[PDB]
Design a protein around this ligand. Structure first.
Ligand SMILES: [Zn+2]
Length: 46
């Protein structure tokens, strides 16, 4: 709704976990990864 102790208002692409800010979808996801640890790695591993 509103904020004060923050600068980045709104962005075209932000994280769903915390709410980070991004400009390109690809980027948004990249970070989103961090929000994952207890998971198996098959075709790709962090
Ligand atoms: Zn996040």
């Amino acid at each position: 709704g509103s904020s004060g102790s923050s600068g980045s208002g709104e962005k075209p692409f932000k994280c769903e976990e915390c709410g980070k800010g991004f400009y390109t979808n690809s980027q948004c996801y990249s970070h989103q990864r961090s929000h994952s640890g207890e998971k198996p790695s098959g075709p790709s591993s962090g």
